[PDB]
Amino acid sequence: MVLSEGEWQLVLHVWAKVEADVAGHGQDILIRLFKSHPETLEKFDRFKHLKTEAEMKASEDLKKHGVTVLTALGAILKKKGHHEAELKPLAQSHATKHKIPIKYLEFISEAIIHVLHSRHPGNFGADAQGAMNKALELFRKDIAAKYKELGYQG
Numbered sequence: 001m002v003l004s005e006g007e008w009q010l011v012l013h014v015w016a017k018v019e020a021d022v023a024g025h026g027q028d029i030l031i032r033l034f035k036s037h038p039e040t041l042e043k044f045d046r047f048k049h050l051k052t053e054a055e056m057k058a059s060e061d062l063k064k065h066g067v068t069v070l071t072a073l074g075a076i077l078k079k080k081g082h083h084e085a086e087l088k089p090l091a092q093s094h095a096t097k098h099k100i101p102i103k104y105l106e107f108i109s110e111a112i113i114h115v116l117h118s119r120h121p122g123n124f125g126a127d128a129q130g131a132m133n134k135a136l137e138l139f140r141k142d143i144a145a146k147y148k149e150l151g152y153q154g
């Protein structure tokens, strides 16, 4: 897959709106993931005790981890597909330490798309949605290929 230049423009234009409140977006994405797919919370030893959404929102450490996640993701998107070097340390930890199947990346992709709609009702159009889905799909496919290069089945 390949994005057009105009699609990357839409992606980066939307990302500038994420960067204006990274913690608010990161916390919302994690909570959306955990409510929609509670099997994913069990991978997080530090947060697995959180049970209701109200608990999650008051957890300072969950919000900080949201920043960690979106910070890494934004660095990758900003490379517009030339991201082999940023992917490697990410692929290495999530395949071999955290043991995250690629299916869980699809789930966080859907959570990102939902939170962008919830947080930007008027800005996040169909074309922007399309471009973001493609950027995230590319991310998932290249990470699945790095899994295999490390000898893992994602």
Ligand code: HEM
Binding pocket: 040, 041, 043, 044, 045, 046, 068, 069, 070, 072, 073, 089, 090, 093, 094, 098, 100, 104, 105, 108
């Ligand atoms: C956009 C997708 C994602 C990005 C950019 C991302 C990024 C990161 C980063 C930067 C870290 C900290 C350092 C590290 O261990 O690598 C981390 C930790 C972690 N990630 Fe992810 N991640 C993503 C998706 C996921 C998903 C979907 C899961 C599981 C459902 C997951 C599971 C974990 C776990 C379990 C840790 C360790 C948490 C801790 O500090 O105790 N990641 N991630």
